[PDB]
Amino acid sequence: NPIEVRESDGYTNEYVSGFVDKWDELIDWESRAESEGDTIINILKERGVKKVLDVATGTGFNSVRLLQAGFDVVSADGSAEMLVKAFDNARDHGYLMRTVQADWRWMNKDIHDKFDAIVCLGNSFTHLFDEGDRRKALAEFYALLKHDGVLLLDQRNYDAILDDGYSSKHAHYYCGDTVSVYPEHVDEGLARFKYEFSDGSVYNLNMFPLRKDYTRQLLHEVGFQEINTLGDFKETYKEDEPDFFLHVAEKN
Ligand SMILES: Nc1ncnc2c1ncn2[C@@H]1O[C@H](CSCC[C@H](N)C(=O)O)[C@@H](O)[C@H]1O
What we know:
Rossmann fold, 2 domains, 8 helices, 32% helix, binds S-adenosyl-L-homocysteine, transferase, S-adenosylmethionine-dependent methyltransferases
């Protein structure tokens, strides 16, 4: 059956769509690419990666960055509305995106290749609140990797927030002062972040506060052999603790 673009289906809603639109309206990709550096691209190049699957395309930032770097990218997302934005953003940068609508829990339904690398970036994995769904998603990613493939999966540093550290009592800024991100409510099973933009817009979003070692455990448990977790400093006013972690999980 064909996929229809809807502002409200099972994979996105108008609120989250408004949030990503607001981020993209105020934060240009050039600035974001400079602030994030070439860590992702360099990891892939040092591994000889050619074919990449983006499982969390969103409005397309990671996919377009990888296309610009010369990778063969397939751009998947659960949301058809997101994929339309991502395709047109790629078009605006002079690239033809290969979009596929797919749910992490059945990734090979319409994707039949295997990939040198998968990227699941922008703190996307934390959207899953059910442990069974987490294992299912990581198992689906594992199965889509070639024998010597690698999964790049990032997350916010929830350990520092759950342990009542400095980062739990303070907002974190991105793209200068364009947006602040504040952990309004934190418990073992839920973090609600307040995102306040420079134009006065406020969005409140829920995430599952994955501890760094719990994510590593899940990756090991679905079959990944070696995992290296890197501190990833993205925020404007850097602290002793990174605001993100990047897991580099090798299939074999
Ligand atoms: N279960 C699921 N299956 C497929 N896609 C999912 C999903 N849960 C969340 N997503 C997607 O994950 C994306 C997170 S947004 C992050 C987008 C991009 N990596 C960036 O950093 O800008 C959303 O577009 C959302 O639709």
